[PDB]
Each structure stands twice: as C-alpha cells, then as structure tokens.
Paper text:
The S-adenosyl-L-methionine-dependent tRNA 4-demethylwyosine synthase [name] catalyzes biosynthesis of 4-demethylwyosine (imG-14), the precursor for wyosine, the hypermodified guanine-derived nucleotide present at position 37 of phenylalanine tRNAs of archaea and eukarya. Eukaryotic [name] enzymes contain N-terminal flavodoxin-like and C-terminal radical-SAM domains.
We determined co-crystal structures of the flavodoxin-like domain of the putative [name] from [name] in complex with flavin mononucleotide (FMN), exploiting an unexpected anomalous scatterer present in the recombinant protein. Our results show how eukaryotic [name] enzymes bind the coenzyme FMN and will help further elucidation of the structural enzymology of 4-demethylwyosine synthesis.
Numbering used by the authors: 78 to 248
Write the structure that this text describes.
C-alpha cells in the first residue's frame, strides 16, 4: 500500500477559512490524496472547531499533518491557531518537541499577491510552517504559496502540483 510507502498511518488535512475558499481547496487536495494513495485514511479538520491541544500539544505517531491556511491582515480566527502553537512552544508544562512522533508536516499557504505583496503575502502560513517545525514535527516538504489572484485554473494547478510534490517528498 502507498500509505505505508510514505511511512504514515493516516493523513490529517487542517484548514482555516473565512470566505470559504480554503475549505473547498482542502476538500480538493484531500480527494487528490485519497486517489493517489488509494486510501480512505484522510481526515479534513477545520482548525476553528477542533480541540487544538488534542492535535498540536500531542500527536498520534506516524500521522502526516497538512496545513492549508489563508492569511488575513485583519484580526481573525487564524490568529488564535498561531497563538495556540506559540503557547505550546513556550509552555513549560508541555515537554519540548511534542510532535516529534508524527510522520511530519507540510504547509500550503493561500494569499493575495496583488494587494499583499511583500511581508504580508501568506504571512500566517509562513508563521505556521515555522511553528510546526519548532514543535518537533519533521518538515516533509517546503512551504507552498498560492496567489489566489491568478486565474482559478492556475490556482488549482498550483495546489495540485504542490500535492503531487508533497507525495514525492513523502516517499
Ligand atoms: C480583509 C482581507 C485581508 C487579507 N490579508 C491578506 C494578507 O495579509 N496576506 C495575504 O497573502 N492575503 C491576504 N488576503 C487574501 C486572502 O488570504 C485570500 O483571499 C484567501 O484565499 C482567503 O481564503 P478564505 O476564502 O478561505 O477565507 C486578505 C483578504 C482579505 C479579504
Ligand atoms: Mg476556519
Ligand atoms: Mg484560499
Ligand atoms: Mg488574521
Ligand atoms: Mg497564507
Ligand atoms: Mg511546509
């Protein structure tokens, strides 16, 4: 089986969304991974409605975490996700590197390169990528970033390319 080929027991796809698009993209990435690995062991999880302590201050051995995250320059629920990661990083009550037992992680960022070019472009996905590594999760693939101001056809090939690249790194 292909899941065992990537030394994983299952794949968790976390996302956050305000306008709904990242949720659709997460569903599409999930369906692509189900087909490629011919597995049903792929979960999609909305970061706003799960207990973050259950997934990011402790981790099921050999799980892959994919994190799909838009960035918002305004206050949003994504701020809470990032704050929760940092709190776990600094909290003496939690041992260091609690996610070292995972297979690993990879982050795919979505953002608006036309209005937020520069420091703000996919800045929260950048932060999430930095913080997951500090929690001890092995970075399986380098951070991906998608400019959603491209034509929608280009947005989908960008995320499908990233998904296929992740699966090759995961081998
Ligand atoms: C109010 C607002 C602020 C945004 N700020 C950023 C930003 O700081 N950096 C970035 O890359 N994209 C930014 N964007 C673009 C969004 O991240 C992008 O539209 C994303 O696809 C939204 O995802 P969603 O539909 O799942 O909520 C912003 C969009 C809005 C509406
Ligand atoms: Mg959300
Ligand atoms: Mg998006
Ligand atoms: Mg925000
Ligand atoms: Mg982003
Ligand atoms: Mg990454």
């Amino acid at each position: 089986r292909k899941l065992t080929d990537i030394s994983a027991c299952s794949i968790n796809i976390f996302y956050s969304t305000l306008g709904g698009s990242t949720q659709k993209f997460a569903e599409h990435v999930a369906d692509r991974i189900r087909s490629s690995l011919q597995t049903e062991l792929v979960e999609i999880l909305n970061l706003d409605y799960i207990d973050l302590d259950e997934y990011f201050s402790k981790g099921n051995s050999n799980t892959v975490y994919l994190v799909l995250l838009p960035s918002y320059a305004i206050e949003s629920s994504i701020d809470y996700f990032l704050s929760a990661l940092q709190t776990t990083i600094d909290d003496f009550r939690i041992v260091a590197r609690p996610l070292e037992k995972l297979r690993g992680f990879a982050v795919l960022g979505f953002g608006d390169f036309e209005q937020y070019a520069g420091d703000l472009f996919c800045y929260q996905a950048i932060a999430a990528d930095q913080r997951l590594a500090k929690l001890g999760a092995q970075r399986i693939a380098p951070l991906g970033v998608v400019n959603v101001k491209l034509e929608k056809a280009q947005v989908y090939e960008a995320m499908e390319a990233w998904t296929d690249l992740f699966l090759q790194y995961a081998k």
